Amino acid sequence: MEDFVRQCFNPMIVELAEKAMKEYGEDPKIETNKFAAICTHLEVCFMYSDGGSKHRFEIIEGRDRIMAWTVVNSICNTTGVEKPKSLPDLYDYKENRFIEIGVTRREVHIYYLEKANKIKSEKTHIHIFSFTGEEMATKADYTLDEESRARIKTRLFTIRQEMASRSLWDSFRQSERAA
Ligand SMILES: [Mn+2]
Ligand SMILES: [Mn+2]
């Protein structure tokens, strides 16, 4: 998987993922599915951002956690928005709401439910992507325009194909579920 992740992702994403894993004391070379999942999720958060104008989103994922909470606090103090109980992925300055982004090798809808239950933050908007071209979002409100989303779905389908082609896909799919 390291050969693969290093070929398919921007080195800064790879570097952020490595930094996140050692920091949680996991080794990218043992936990290779986790490494790939981290990369994939970060990539999506960046592509999601690149869907709005430059004023639109605050990317909270991929940042030191402690600092990231301070940013969520400053947003919540400045705007009046309720404080989420779980750290989100983005803030949307147009809609004035936090967003949780999910990326799943399972079905979009069961993964939504599990995410909704897990994050215990009723006001966070949830947007789930699969590697099969599917998506689900809170109230079928998908936030971005259609082209921005197709770029994400396409990228995820592409990743899945490049994994499958290296015989990496089955292991990556089944590892989520084992988790
Ligand atoms: Mn996150
Ligand atoms: Mn997420």
From Swiss-Prot:
Superkingdom field: Viruses
Result when mutating A36V: Reduced affinity for Baloxavir and Baloxavir marboxil
Subcellular location(s) per record: Host cytoplasm; Host nucleus
Full protein name: Polymerase acidic protein
Catalytic residues, chain numbering: K115
Record: residues binding Mn(2+) 2: E61, D89
Span of the entire protein shown here: 1 to 196 of 716
Gene name as annotated: PA
Quaternary structure and interacting proteins, as annotated: Influenza RNA polymerase is composed of three subunits: PB1, PB2 and PA. Interacts (via C-terminus) with PB1 (via N-terminus).
